[PDB]
Structures are given as structure tokens and as C-alpha cells.
């Protein structure tokens, strides 16, 4: 191999020459700023300077080149990267950095800024990044922007930059089958408002934008509104659209295929190769669709589903390369369509079984057997979904183990064996709450409306303690009627605007039975909503978690397994 010591010595000597200006022969003249540099470094880094000097043109012998349509700071950072290899990339100058990298065809920095932008893609810059990837040919960025823009924009459709988009880009966006919309009318009104941004600059594109939307809205309202905005005496558009909507037979999209499903993690892996897998139950389809394995079989993790219906994974441990397990603070995000886990910004401290709770767009991970264990062994930390970073919050006053947390009334409610503390995001403080009369642990709670339903606790039992936020008191309702001499595995969840329970029971010398019940809020009784047949759902285990979310049956595949 090439001697790295001599390579770094040569590089540092060249950078010293650059700083001291000894062997510089070519100077870059940009907006009156002198940039003394060499030809060898520029040729090695950029693919434009190699064609600027070794070409035989008038600049081959000229020692002063007036490089135009560039920026001084961008050129300076590119030169210093070419001379030392350090590329300091902030969150603002990456746009002009990519512009100048495409202006010098510097694939070295082009790849670096492409990776930075593939990491930086978020909701508030999705349309801007897609427009940037349309301006400069970049297929990876274009595809990532396609996916993220489709999802987040069809969720939001309010960005100001969406109005200033090319016709081809909008045709690609609207005609795609990856849009995430609960209805087919929101895309219609989004297209209408985009068209009405201008009057005559969009008339020619009117015949094309309607060609990608289904005819179910091409004969109903929002056709006379276009006639109102039609240019005067234009008889080539009204009669055109009058007899035009014959083709494009109505085909349902993919965004209207989200159903309230119970996502399960760390289930009993059918194949012994994996230790744990992930499955999902369909309360409506009455089937069990398989889910992608956790990233690097990440066990002992926590789940959260934001009000925007997004799944996240935090904490967990990976078997170190017989008992062998090491805890990692890696963070991941689940793609609802690609059926894969996209990595995100990792946490600061590793966790085991963390309680992920979403509130005000922030992901809160409370506790989880942190590595530190100092006097603040109860330190909790939130995540920024806008800036893609983690921020510490007010620590929990008391150290708790095997706890659960929910969000009610824009506040974090973490529950332990007998104590409860409410966190105020506005003031970053903890307030003492009501005290339970029973010592129970290893249970889960579901936030339904303005009440907290702590179900089960210790196997578990059928004890239920209902807490009211407005009343600040713990009261008993009833006990779930289950078979005696059994060990039910209770799982509290909210589904169909009602509090249902996923309770798996096992009898003596008998296999586990799956059945869910609907708890009557006013009657204080668990009614049999549906019985899960064992012909579709097999054993899941004991350390499995359940959460409420929506998934697409089309993108996912049915798990092939014998009843």
C-alpha cells in the first residue's frame, strides 16, 4: 500500500505552501478577491480545472483567470478542502456548496454534500430540496425527495415553494402512486390552488394536470371554478374539457389503504436463525402481515406512533461480536411504504426498553436503564423532529425501573409501581400526582381521551386502576373476566375510538389463546369485540410490545406460516 506517513507529510507541506504562498503561479480572480493557488491541487480535486489548464486554450499560459458565476466563501472552502481534506459543512451553505461543486464537477465534495442532504431531508425543506434536485441532476436526491415530499406534502400540502415548481415535476408528483392521502379530494384542491397561482401561465398545463387525476373529480365541482378563472372568450378550453374526460378510468390510489392495525415487535421468530421478529395483526382483515426485522435485530427497544402516524425506534441492544449483548443508542425510523428502517440521528446515552412518547412533535424517551447511573440516573431527553437533534429535559425527580409513560393534555405522564409525576413541557418541571393504592409493575397504559388506564401489573393480573386528569384521582372500575388458573398477558391500546385490550391467556398444559375485548367506558365492562382464531396468529412470546398505528396492506406481504 501507499505509505500514509509520506502522504500526510506531503499534504501538510502543500498546505503550508498554500498558506505561505511560495509556489503559487495561478490566481483565481472572483469578484475582486485574490485566490493564489496551484494547478496540481486544482487538477487533482476538480475535474473542471484539469480541463481549464491542460486544454491548450488561452488560459493555459495566462496566469490570471476571472472565474465568474461563483461565490467567494464557497470557492475558499473548496480550495481549503482540496488542500487539507477538511470539509466543514453547516446547515445553510450546503446549497451554494452543491452549486459550486456542480460548477467544478468536484465529485469528492459532490458526494459529501449529497450525503449531507440525504441526511438533512425533512418536512420544511422537502419541496425546496426536490426543486434543487430537479435543477441539478441527482437521481439519489431526486428519489429520496420524491418519497419524502410525497408523504409529508400529501400530509401537509401548504408549503410556499410548492407554487414555484416546474410542470414536469408536478406531473411526476401528482401522477405517482406513492401519495399518502386519506382522500382523493385534497390532491384535487392542491392542484386547483397550484393552477390558480397564475391564469395564463397555467392554461397550457391545465390540460395535462387533469390528465393525471382520476375522473371521479373531473366531472364534479371544481370545473365551473376553472371556467370562472378562464381567460375571456377562450373557446379552446371549455369545450375541450367538456368532451375530454372519456379516458383515465377511475383507479383508487394507495394512500386510501391505511387501516388501524396493531403493530407487534420482538415476536417469536418462526425461523430459529433470528432470535426475535416483528409481526402485525389486522383487526379488519383478520390476518397477520409480516413486518421487517428490527435494524440489526435490535432487541429491548421502544415504539411510538406520532399523531402524524409515524413509527420510531430508540435504544435497544445488539449481540456483541452463551450470553453476549451490548447496548447501543442508535435511532431508526420506519418507512411505511418501502418496508425498511431508515437510520436517524442516534441518541446521547444507550437505553434498554425505553418509553417513547410523542408530544408537541417531540419524541420523549423516559428512562430505560441508562449506562451512566450517576445521581441523575433518571435523566430523560427529547428529540427534535424539525432540526433532527436531541435535547435534554428536566430530570425525573425519582429513579424508577420498569415504568410506562403516556401523553395526555399536552403533558407527559410517566407511571411507576405506585408513584406518578406529570411533566410540563411549557415550564420544564415535574409536579406530584395522585398515589396508587396497589403496588403493581410490568404493565402498560393506554391514553384514551383525557383519562389514563393502567391495565394489569405485578405474571400480570386483571386489576384496572383508572386515573382522571381533570379529577386527579385513581379509582377502580372492574376486573377483566378471564379463565382461572391462567396467566393472561394484558396489552392496553386505543382503537376505533374505544379502549380495547389485547390479552393473551395460557391455561395449564394448554397453548396460548389470543382474544381481544372491548371495555365499555360508561358500563365499566369488557365486552367481547372479536376472538382471534389461532389458524392465523401463532405464539408471539412474552417480551413483545403492541402499539396503535396505520399500515398499508399492499406494500406489506402476508407471512407464510402454518396455523
Amino acid at each position: 500500500q501507499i505509505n500514509t506517513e509520506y502522504a500526510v507529510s506531503l499534504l501538510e507541506q502543500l498546505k503550508l505552501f498554500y498558506e505561505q504562498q511560495l509556489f503559487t503561479d495561478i490566481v483565481l480572480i472572483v469578484e475582486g478577491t485574490e485566490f493564489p493557488c496551484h494547478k496540481m491541487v486544482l487538477a487533482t480535486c476538480s475535474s473542471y480545472f484539469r480541463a481549464m489548464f491542460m486544454s491548450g486554450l488561452s488560459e493555459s499560459k495566462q496566469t490570471h483567470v476571472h472565474l465568474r458565476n461563483v461565490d467567494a466563501a464557497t470557492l475558499q472552502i473548496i480550495i481549503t478542502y482540496a488542500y487539507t481534506g477538511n470539509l466543514a459543512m453547516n446547515d445553510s451553505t450546503v446549497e451554494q456548496l452543491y452549486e459550486t461543486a456542480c460548477f467544478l464537477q468536484v465529485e469528492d465534495v459532490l458526494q459529501r454534500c449529497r450525503e449531507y442532504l440525504i441526511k438533512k431531508i425533512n418536512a420544511e425543506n422537502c419541496v425546496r430540496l426536490l426543486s434543487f434536485a430537479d435543477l441539478f441532476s441527482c437521481e439519489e436526491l431526486k428519489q429520496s425527495a420524491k418519497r419524502m415530499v410525497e408523504h409529508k406534502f400529501t400530509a401537509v400540502y401548504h408549503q410556499d415553494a410548492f407554487m414555484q415548481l416546474s410542470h414536469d415535476l408536478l406531473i411526476d408528483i401528482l401522477s405517482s402512486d406513492n401519495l399518502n392521502v386519506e382522500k382523493e379530494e385534497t390532491v384535487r384542491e392542491a392542484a386547483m390552488l397550484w393552477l390558480e397561482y397564475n391564469t395564463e401561465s397555467r392554461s397550457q398545463y391545465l390540460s395535462s394536470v387533469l390528465s393525471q387525476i382520476r375522473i371521479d373529480a373531473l366531472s364534479e365541482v371544481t370545473q365551473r371554478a376553472w371556467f370562472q378563472g378562464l381567460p375571456p372568450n377562450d373557446k379552446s378550453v371549455v369545450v375541450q374539457g367538456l368532451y375530454k374526460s372519456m379516458p383515465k378510468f377511475f383507479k383508487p390510489r394507495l394512500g386510501m389503504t391505511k387501516e388501524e392495525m396493531m403493530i407487534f415487535i420482538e415476536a417469536s421468530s418462526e425461523n430459529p436463525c433470528s432470535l426475535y421478529s416483528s409481526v402485525c395483526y389486522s383487526p379488519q382483515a383478520e390476518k397477520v402481515y409480516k413486518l421487517c426485522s428490527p435494524p440489526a435485530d435490535l432487541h429491548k427497544v421502544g415504539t411510538v406512533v406520532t399523531p402524524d402516524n409515524d413509527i420510531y425506534i430508540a435504544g435497544g441492544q445488539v449481540p456483541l461480536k452463551q450470553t453476549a449483548f451490548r447496548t447501543v443508542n442508535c435511532f431508526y425510523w420506519f418507512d411505511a411504504q418501502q418496508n425498511t428502517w431508515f437510520p436517524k440521528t442516534p441518541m446521547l446515552f444507550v437505553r434498554i426498553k425505553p418509553s417513547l412518547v410523542c408530544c408537541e412533535g417531540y419524541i420523549y424517551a423516559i428512562g430505560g436503564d441508562s449506562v451512566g447511573g450517576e445521581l441523575n440516573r433518571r435523566t430523560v431527553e427529547r428529540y427534535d423532529t424539525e432540526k433532527d437533534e436531541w435535547t435534554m429535559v428536566s430530570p425525573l425527580p425519582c429513579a424508577w425501573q420498569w415504568s410506562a409513560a403516556v401523553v395526555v393534555h399536552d403533558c407527559i405522564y410517566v407511571m411507576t409501581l405506585n408513584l406518578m409525576y406529570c411533566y410540563f413541557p411549557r415550564s420544564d418541571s415535574w409536579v406530584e400526582m395522585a398515589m396508587r393504592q396497589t403496588s403493581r409493575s410490568f404493565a402498560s397504559a393506554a391514553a384514551f381521551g383525557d383519562k389514563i388506564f393502567y391495565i394489569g401489573g405485578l405474571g400480570s393480573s386483571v386489576t384496572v386502576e383508572i386515573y382522571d386528569v381533570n379529577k386527579n384521582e385513581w379509582k377502580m372500575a372492574a376486573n377483566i373476566p378471564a379463565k382461572r388458573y391462567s396467566d393472561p398477558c394484558v396489552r392496553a391500546v386505543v382503537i376505533s375510538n374505544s379502549l380495547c385490550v389485547f390479552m393473551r391467556e395460557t391455561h395449564l398444559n394448554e397453548r396460548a389463546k389470543y382474544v381481544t375485548y372491548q371495555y365499555d367506558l360508561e358500563l365499566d365492562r369488557w365486552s367481547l369485540r372479536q376472538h382471534i382464531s389461532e389458524r392465523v396468529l401463532w405464539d408471539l412470546g412474552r417480551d413483545f410490545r403492541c402499539t396503535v398505528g396505520k399500515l398499508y396492506p399492499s406494500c406489506l406481504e402476508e407471512s407464510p406460516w402454518k396455523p
Binding site: F424, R426, S427
Partner: protein, 76 residues
């Protein structure tokens, strides 16, 4: 008149007891909460509460600055 003064103190005591541990309003955010808390008591009387909430700006303890209606003084 006596019951009108009773309502006048009933709204002010509620607004000073509740809003000390809650968020801030921009134009008409906290008024909905204060009317919901008094929904079972009497009529909201929007004009009365609007005229009375702007009288506390003359001094301290949550003056609720009208022009700078972006952050309220969460102090005592």
C-alpha cells in the same frame, strides 16, 4: 349588581389560578379554556371578559402585554 361583581371576581380568580400553570394565548386561545371552565357556572359573557382581561396590564403579576402578545410573564 352584586352578582355581576361576583362574576367579575369569579372570572379573575379563575384566570389567575389557572393560567399560572398553563401556556399563553395569542389572540383568543386561553379565553376558550376560561369559558369552558365556567361553562357550567354561567354565560361566558365575551364582551365582559374581554374588557376585564385588559385591565390587569397596568401593573405586575402577568400584565399580559397587548402589543407584545407573543410571550406572557410566567412570574409572580
Amino acid at each position: 349588581q352584586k352578582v355581576d361583581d361576583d362574576r367579575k371576581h369569579e372570572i379573575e380568580a379563575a384566570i389567575v389560578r389557572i393560567m399560572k400553570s398553563r401556556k399563553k394565548m395569542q389572540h383568543n386561545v386561553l379565553v376558550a379554556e376560561v369559558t369552558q371552565q365556567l361553562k357550567a357556572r354561567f354565560l361566558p359573557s365575551p364582551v365582559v371578559i374581554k374588557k376585564r382581561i385588559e385591565g390587569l396590564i397596568e401593573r405586575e403579576y402577568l400584565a399580559r402585554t397587548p402589543e407584545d402578545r407573543k410571550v406572557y410573564t410566567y412570574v409572580a
